[PDB]
């Protein structure tokens, strides 16, 4: 709206016909809306078009609306006798009543000294066992990371690495060259009938469903994790990116688009819009 | 009797904290000592950039792993080629030497590891058999007695003196124990003290 | 198996026999069932490239129909065509599921010498009767029990911490990083291909361990792999519906892990067998019928602390008997 | 009179230290040597 307020013309914003994020297919064609800009089916490809390399050589990309990166969106008074095997405690209290009962029978000092020493040995053992077992329990919980670096999840055959199906991220990992990212591309291609998923809201859904992570955009993880609390923003920025103003090669105002784009960033109402829409014991 | 009760209470709090800390620290030490494998399957050693994977340089083992196809063995070929002047070593006795010298492992033959580990105590035969092989009677192609070689070979295995030749030429409780020392020692010490007290009497 | 002689198109039964029967009743096909001469599901060869087994036979066009539990693999799709998926499938992993243990984490000679020392310090205390000396002795005894019971808790702590960190193997990567239970399948496997020709590096290294020890690791038959798993830790990678109809009748077994890949067995034919498409159409007709599912029904159907409790109770009874002795 | 050659490797060929090294076969002895 503010871009058209700069450029003083109207804009017939239409749905992308395929509606995919668009990728250069093996038939040479960019798919989706990248197909629409490779078609001249539209000139103002106004979306979150991730300005990548194969996005560059197929259509012009103006100055970016913002920075971007690939992030992983992944999932997330009764401990008293709980480290003990929870049926042993009934036998314990029964033993305490019994050992007192043998003492009360011993009322009507060496005989009592015998059961004293016995009760002491048993008491030492089982509270040592309790402290040991609670030590093991607290130790295992603390020592689990469980998956923070994305290379782990690439090696982790039990968690599902997932991307927005035929996405710009699918290009960035699938056409990649770095070795762990390459193995990630192989696993992303391998059981892909189980492994790839298309819609971004469905991406958050499948992340909210089972042990599949949506390899989403940075601002995607921002708007989603601010909207929903149970999803963790695992990993750092996998790379640099930016959703830039795509256009055809040599557009009527592409340089003017980057110019008024830098004007609007200088006008800083873009960041105003970023706030206003992209908001033991 | 509250002044001494103040010192009894603080003393109990102190001795309990220090004992609980000590049992905690000994718990952590034993746990870490036990949880270290450290390198048993060879694939870890291939990933282990701090250990040195090594082979009898330009060897049949280098032919196996270096021309391999399996992925971890392929990464082993890459690391075996990568810093190879720092990483490859030629002589088998030098292989045992670099095993007994630094964190380099000699990828030796099975019978090689047999004769060596029977000869030397401090070297462990880590891993299982990485593949199958056999030291066979080489000859030129179409040899004058290659069939006769396999024939008398099966005869000698049937004679079984080859295995005879294999035998012939191819042949806690002490951790915490110092507690007992402290015990006996102080026991004798207080025995002496009580004897001195009887003398005083 | 029965008490008479049958043969050929009468010597078999199962679900796929019913598949042949009902597919015959649909397509009007007549058929004689012949087994695989190579005795395996067969694969494109390691160096010859040609298919083996039934894949060789239909590759040789030596037999028309192949209604077996045969995997519709994309590599196998090039050698021969298939119908629609008969039963959905996937690879999965099949594997099987005292009164000293009180004193376990202390090595037994130490706990023997402990009681020896208890008697010894008791002897020194008795010899003190010929109290500062009593105090010093009591204090060394304090230090003693403290180190012993504390180090005890350390050993039982650590040795509980490691075993509560190890078990079980309940994932594909869990069987992958381990090297204890043998992991494989029967020979000439499309399953063994889907592990072997995979690019998922966990499955690749599993193929490396299997084909490494390929004489003893891999099996010849699924029943043979079942015997290898029920006898020892030769756990089998195997097919889905096979794992189900194995596991429903062998309780000592267990179906670990999830779904490795996604496949489906079905009717296979050579490239250019004209009944392939109409067979797939009537197969969809039988899937709309439900005799597939009907056939699937008809054919595819106080660890150690208890030790010391005993010890204490025994002490109790013994000393009550000692008290009877005192009354005497 | 067959050219039976090798590269010594312990203990296959014992390579016993006979500093008075004889000729050919009598030069060294071992498991592979006695096998030959």
- The experimental method, as deposited, was cryo-EM
Question: Does A186 touch chain B if contact means CB atoms closer than 8 Å?
Answer: no
Task: Tell me the binding residues of C for L-glutamate.
Answer: 69, 71, 76, 190-191, 239
Residue that the structure tokens 């701090």 belong to? B50
Task: Give the integer Cα–Cα distance in Å for C266 and C260.
Answer: 19
- Contact present, B29 and B22 (Cβ < 8 Å): no
The Cα–Cα gap between C271 and C328 comes to 100
- Nearest residue of chain C to residue A187 (CA atoms): C200
10 Å CB burial of residue C157 (0-12, 13-18, 19+) is buried
Which residue shows structure tokens 């129909």?
C65
Question: Residue C190's CB: how many other CB atoms inside 10 A?
Answer: 25
Closest by CA to B178, choosing from A94, A30, A210, C110, is C110
Q: Which residue has the tokens 């800083």?
A: A268
**CA distance to partner chain B, nearest, from residue A153 (Å):** 17
Q: Is B14 exposed, middle or buried (0-12, 13-18, 19+ CB in 10 A)?
A: exposed
Cβ atoms B95, B89 nearer than 8 A:
yes
Q: How far is CA B163 from the centre of its chain?
A: 28
Tell me whether B170 touches chain D (CB under 8 Å).
Answer: yes
- Asked whether A136 and A124 are in contact (CB, 8 A), the reply is no
Report the gap between the CA of C95 and the closest CA in chain B (Å).
Answer: 21
Rounded to an integer, what distance in angstroms lies between the CA atom of residue B128 and that of residue B115? 16
Residue B89 to residue B58: CA distance in whole angstroms: 9
Tokens standing for A178? 């770095």
The answer to whether chain D touches chain B by having 3 or more C-beta pairs less than 8 angstroms apart is yes
Phi first, then psi: give them for residue A196, nearest 5 degrees.
-105, 150
Contacts of B30 in chain C (CB under 8 A): 154-155, 157-158
The string of DSSP codes covering C126-137 is HHH---HHHHHH
Which of C207, C192, C188 is closest to C56 using CA atoms? C188
b/e sequence C50-83, b meaning 16+ C-beta within 10 Å: ebbbbbbbbbeeebebbbbbbbbbeebeebbbbb
Partner residue opposite B34 with nearest CB, options C124, C162, C208 = C162
Beta pairing, strands B52-55 & C253-256: unpaired
∠ CA(B68), CA(B71), CA(B75), 5° rounding?
A: 80
Three-state secondary structure call for residue C176: helix
Handedness of CA B144, B146, B148, B153 (dihedral sign): positive
Q: Which of residues 52-111 of C touch B (CB under 8 A)?
A: 106-110
Residues after which a C–N gap over 2.5 Å breaks chain A: 76, 108, 279
Q: Does an H or E element contain A214, and which?
A: strand A212-217
Tokens of D3: 């050219």
Q: In this structure, how many other beta carbons lie within 10 angstroms of the beta carbon of residue B106? A: 24
Cβ-based neighbours of C103, under 8 Å, separated by 6 or more: C111
CB B169 within 8 A of CB D14: yes
- The Cα A128–Cα A131 span in angstroms is 5
C137 contacts C125 by C-beta, under 8 angstroms: yes
- Smallest CA-to-CA distance from C172 within C86, C237, C96 is with C237
Contact between C52 and C186 (Cβ < 8 Å): no
Please give, rounded to a whole number of angstroms, the shortest distance from the CA of C245 to a CA of chain A: 24
Q: How many helices (H) and strands (E) does chain B have?
A: 10, 2
Which DSSP string corresponds to A11-50? ------SS-S---B-TTS-B-HHHHHHHTTS-S-B-S--B
Closest among C112, C120, C111, C110 to C141, alpha carbons compared: C120
Q: In which residue are the tokens 């190879």 written?
A: B84
CA-based nearest residue to C169, from C151, C182, C155, C158: C182
Residue where the block lists tokens 């376990």 = C104
**Binding-site annotation, residues of C:** 69, 71, 76, 190-191, 239
Q: Which two tokens stand for residue C43?
A: 């694969």
Please identify among residues 162-221 of chain C the ones whose CB lies closer than 8 Å to any CB of chain B.
162, 165, 179, 201, 204-205, 207-208, 211-213, 215
- A138 inside 8 A of chain B by CB: no
For residue A164, what are the β-bridge partners? A197
Residue C268, SS3 per DSSP:
strand
Distance between CA atoms of residues B136 and C54, nearest Å: 36
d(Cα C94, Cα C229) in Å, to the nearest integer? 8
Cβ-based neighbours of A133, under 8 Å, separated by 6 or more: A83, A84, C160
SS3 A85: coil
Which neighbouring-strand residues pair with C72?
none
Q: Across the interface, which of C156, C174, C312 has its CB nearest the CB of A129? A: C156
Q: How far apart are CA A244 and CA C292, in angstroms?
A: 53
Q: Give φ, ψ of C266 to 5 degrees.
A: 180, 180
Give Cα separations from A193 to A31, C91, C262 (angstroms): 20, 15, 8
Strand arrangement, sheet containing C234-238: C182-184, C234-238, C92-96, C253-256
Determine if residue C47 is left, alpha or beta; phi over 0 gives left, psi from -120 to 50 gives alpha, anything else beta.
alpha
Q: What residues of chain B lie within 8 A of the CB of C204, using their CB?
A: 70-71
Distance CA C241, CA C266 (A): 13
Compare all CA atoms of chain B with the CA of D12 and give the residue at the minimum distance.
Answer: B170
**Resolution of this entry, Å:** 5.8
Residues whose CB falls within 8 Å of the CB of residue B179, separated by 6 or more in sequence, listed in order: C143, C144, C147, C148
Breaks after residues in chain C, judged by C–N over 2.5 Å: 97, 130, 301
C184: left (phi over 0), alpha (psi -120 to 50) or beta: beta
Q: Which of B119, B140, B169 should one mutate to test binding to chain D, selecting the residue with the greatest count of D CBs within 10 A?
A: B169
Identify all chain B residues contacting A187, using CB atoms and an 8 Å cutoff.
none
The Cα B124–Cα B121 span in angstroms is: 8
Give CA angle at B127 (B123, B130), nearest 5°.
Answer: 125
Q: How far apart are the first and last CA of chain D?
A: 13
C-alpha pair distances (Å), A189 with each of A29, A152, A162, A184: 20, 17, 10, 8
- Are C and A touching by the rule of 3+ CB pairs within 8 Å? yes
Give the DSSP letter of residue B102: S
* Shortest CA distance from C113: residue in chain B: B180
CB atoms within 10 A of CB A166: 19
Q: Are A68 and A244 in contact (CB under 8 A)?
A: no
Terminal-to-terminal C-alpha distance of chain B = 31
Q: Strand C234-238 relative to strand C182-184: parallel, antiparallel, unpaired? A: parallel
Count of helix runs (H) and strand runs (E) in chain A: 13, 6
Q: Cα–Cα distance between C32 and C10 in angstroms, integer?
A: 8
Q: Are A133 and C160 in contact (CB under 8 A)?
A: yes
Nearest to C293 by CA among C41, C27, C66, C22: C22
Query: Is the CB of residue C154 less than 8 Å away from at least one CB of chain B?
Result: yes
From B162's Cα to the closest Cα of chain D, the distance in A is: 7
Bin C42: left if φ > 0, else alpha if -120 < ψ < 50, else beta.
Answer: left
Contact A118, A96 (CB under 8 A): no
CA dihedral A26, A30, A31, A36 (to 10 degrees): -150
Burial class (CB in 10 A: 0-12, 13-18, 19+), C133: buried
The CA distance from C159 to A136, in Å, is: 9
CB A31 within 8 A of CB A24: yes
Decide if B176 contacts C114 (C-beta within 8 A). no
Q: What is the DSSP letter of C80?
A: S
Say how far apart CA A138 and CA A135 lie, in whole Å.
5
Q: Which chains touch A (3 or more CB pairs under 8 A)?
A: B, C
Q: What is the Cα–Cα distance from C56 to C36, expressed in whole angstroms?
A: 10
Looking up tokens 């690749």 gives C204
Q: CA–CA separation, C266 vs C245, rounded Å?
A: 18
Q: How many CA atoms lie within 13 A of A194 on its CB side?
A: 18
- Please state, in angstroms and rounded to a whole number, the distance separating the CA atoms of residues C129 and A37: 105
Chain centroid to CA A198: 16
- At residue B92, φ and ψ (nearest 5 deg) are -70, -40
Rg for chain C (alpha carbons), in Å? 32
Joined together, the tokens standing for residue A198 give: 């298309």
**Tokens in use for B154?**
């099966």
């Amino acid at each position: 709206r503010e871009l058209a307020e700069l450029l003083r013309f109207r804009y017939r914003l239409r749905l992308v016909e395929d509606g995919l994020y668009g990728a250069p297919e093996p038939n040479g064609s960019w798919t989706g809306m990248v197909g629409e800009l490779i078609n001249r089916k539209a000139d103002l490809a106004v979306a979150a078009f991730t300005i990548t390399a194969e996005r560059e050589k197929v259509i012009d990309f103006s100055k970016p609306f913002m920075t971007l990166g690939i992030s992983i969106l992944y999932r997330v008074y009764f401990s008293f006798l709980d480290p003990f095997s929870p049926a042993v405690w009934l036998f314990m209290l029964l033993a305490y009543l019994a050992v007192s009962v043998v003492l009360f029978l011993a009322a009507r000092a060496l005989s009592t000294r015998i059961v004293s020493g016995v009760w002491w040995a048993f008491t030492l053992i089982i509270i040592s066992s309790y402290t040991a077992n609670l030590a093991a329990f607290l130790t295992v919980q603390r020592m689990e990371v469980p998956v923070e670096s994305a290379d782990d999840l690439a090696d982790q055959t039990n968690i599902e690495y997932g991307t927005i199906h035929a996405g710009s991220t699918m290009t960035f990992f699938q056409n990649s060259r770095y070795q762990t990212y390459q193995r990630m591309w192989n696993y992303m291609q391998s059981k892909q009938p189980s492994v790839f998923v298309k819609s971004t809201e469905e991406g958050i859904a499948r992340v909210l469903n089972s042990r599949y992570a949506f390899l989403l955009e940075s601002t995607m993880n921002e708007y989603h994790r601010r909207l929903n609390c149970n999803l963790t923003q695992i990993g750092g920025l996998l790379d640099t990116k930016g959703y830039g103003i795509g256009m055809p090669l040599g557009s009527p105002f592409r340089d003017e688009i980057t110019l008024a784009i830098l004007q609007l960033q200088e006008n800083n109402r873009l960041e105003i819009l970023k706030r206003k829409w992209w908001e033991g014991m | 009797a509250l002044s001494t009760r103040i010192v009894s209470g603080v003393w109990w709090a102190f001795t309990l904290i220090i004992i609980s800390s000590y049992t905690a620290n000994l718990a952590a030490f034993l746990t870490v000592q036990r949880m270290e494998v450290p390198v048993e399957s060879a694939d870890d050693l291939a990933d282990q950039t701090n250990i040195e994977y090594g082979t009898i340089h330009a060897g049949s083992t280098m032919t196996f792993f270096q021309n391999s196809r399996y992925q971890t063995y392929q990464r082993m070929w890459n690391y075996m080629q990568s810093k190879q002047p720092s990483v490859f070593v030629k002589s088998t006795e030098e292989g045992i030497a670099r095993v007994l010298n630094s964190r380099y492992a000699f990828l030796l033959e099975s019978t090689m590891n047999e004769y060596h580990r029977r000869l030397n105590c401090n070297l462990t035969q880590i891993g299982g058999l990485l593949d199958t092989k056999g030291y066979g009677i080489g000859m030129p192609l179409g040899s004058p007695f290659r069939d006769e070689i396999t024939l008398a070979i099966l005869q000698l295995q049937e004679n079984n003196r080859l295995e005879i030749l294999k035998r012939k030429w191819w042949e806690g409780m002490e951790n915490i124990g110092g507690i007992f020392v402290v015990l006996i020692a102080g026991l004798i010490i207080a025995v002496f003290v009580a004897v001195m007290e009887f003398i005083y009497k | 198996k029965s008490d008479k002689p049958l043969y050929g198109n009468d010597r078999f039964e199962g679900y796929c026999i019913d598949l042949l029967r009902e597919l015959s009743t649909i397509l009007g096909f007549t058929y004689e069932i012949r087994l695989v001469e190579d005795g395996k599901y067969g694969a494109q060869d390691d160096v010859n490239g040609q298919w083996n087994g039934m894949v060789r036979e239909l590759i040789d066009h030596k037999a028309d129909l192949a209604v077996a539990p045969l995997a519709i693999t994309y590599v196998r799709e090039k050698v021969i065509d298939f119908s629609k998926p008969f039963m959905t499938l996937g690879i999965s992993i099949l594997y099987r599921k005292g009164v000293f243990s009180f004193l376990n984490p202390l090595s037994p000679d130490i706990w023997m010498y402990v009681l020896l020392a208890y008697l010894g310090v008791s002897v020194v205390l008795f010899v003190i009767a010929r109290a500062l000396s009593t105090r010093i002795v009591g204090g060394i005894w304090w230090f003693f029990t403290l180190i012993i019971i504390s180090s005890y808790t350390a050993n039982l702590a650590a040795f509980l911490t490691v075993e509560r960190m190890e078990s079980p193997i309940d994932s594909a990567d869990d069987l992958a990083k381990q090297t204890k239970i043998e992991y494989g399948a029967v020979e000439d496997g499309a399953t063994m291909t889907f592990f072997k020709k995979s690019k998922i590096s966990t499955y690749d290294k599993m193929w490396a361990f299997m084909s490494s020890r390929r004489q003893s690791v891999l099996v010849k038959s699924n029943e043979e792999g079942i015997q290898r798993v029920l006898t020892s830790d030769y756990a089998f990678l195997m097919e889905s519906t096979t794992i189900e109809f194995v596991t429903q009748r062998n309780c000592n077994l267990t179906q670990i892990g999830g779904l490795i890949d996604s496949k489906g067995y079905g009717v296979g034919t050579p490239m250019g067998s004209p009944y392939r498409d109409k067979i797939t159409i009537a197969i969809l007709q039988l899937q709309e019928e439900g005799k597939l599912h009907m056939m699937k029904e008809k054919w595819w159907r106080v660890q150690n602390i208890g030790g010391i409790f005993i010890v204490l109770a025994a002490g109790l009874v013994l000393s009550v008997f000692v008290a009877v002795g005192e009354f005497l | 009179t067959l050219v039976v050659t090798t590269i010594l490797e312990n203990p296959y060929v014992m390579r016993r230290p006979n500093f008075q090294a004889l000729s050919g076969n009598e030069r060294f002895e071992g498991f592979c040597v006695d096998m030959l």
